[PDB]
């Protein structure tokens, strides 16, 4: 397999969430606010749902645009709608 192409992961990594990374990001972005006890878990869940939406959209865009391998324009066009739908 070429280094440019990555095969799909047959096994999923452990479902442990990087709570420290999310806390550090939320602190460096908005340091004036304070997150609650387990808000990072809800942020992780929202990120999981966003990634799932983006993945399915990129998959259908790549399979509908005469392609067996996900390219850059496919995920680009998927993000251009997913990012707009994810805000409210």
């Amino acid at each position: 397999m070429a280094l440019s192409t990555i095969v799909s992961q047959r096994k999923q990594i452990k479902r442990k969430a990087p709570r420290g990374f999310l806390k550090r990001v939320f602190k460096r972005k908005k340091p004036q606010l304070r997150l609650e006890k387990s808000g990072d878990l809800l942020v992780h869940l929202n990120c999981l749902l966003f990634v799932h939406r983006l993945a399915e959209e990129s998959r259908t865009n790549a399979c509908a645009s005469k392609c067996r391998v996900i390219n850059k324009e496919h995920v680009l066009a998927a993000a251009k709608v997913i990012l707009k739908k994810s805000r409210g």
């Binding site: 550090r24 809800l42 929202n46 995920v75 994810s86 409210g88």
Partner: protein
């Protein structure tokens, strides 16, 4: 002698989750794209949480703000509440901390 910044180390988890959910071979040029979209999504999420907390009248972020945001996103409704999504997508160690449960003489944890 490898060197990894915490940002890429944090984003690699979601990148691998995306690669697993795609169920299709993906070119390497899409990884940085997914990372940039994740950064933009995190920025917009932080801004939305900030404005929601400001409108709520308090400085701290509470789970009702995230519930309102997910409801505006179309993910959470009155029938399909947040508990259903927590049970569907989260392991037991997090469900024990998020969803309240009673045991041993009506002892409820967390207090809800």
């Amino acid at each position: 002698r490898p060197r990894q910044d915490p940002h890429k180390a944090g984003l690699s988890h979601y990148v691998k989750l995306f690669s697993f959910y795609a169920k299709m071979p993906m070119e390497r040029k899409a990884l940085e794209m997914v990372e940039k979209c994740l950064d933009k999504y995190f920025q917009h999420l932080c801004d939305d949480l900030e404005v929601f907390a400001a409108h709520a009248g308090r400085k701290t972020v509470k789970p009702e703000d995230l519930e309102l945001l997910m409801r505006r996103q179309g993910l959470v409704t009155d029938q399909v509440s947040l508990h259903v999504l927590v049970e569907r997508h989260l392991p037991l160690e997090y469900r024990q901390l998020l969803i309240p449960c009673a045991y041993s003489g009506n002892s409820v944890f967390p207090a809800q």
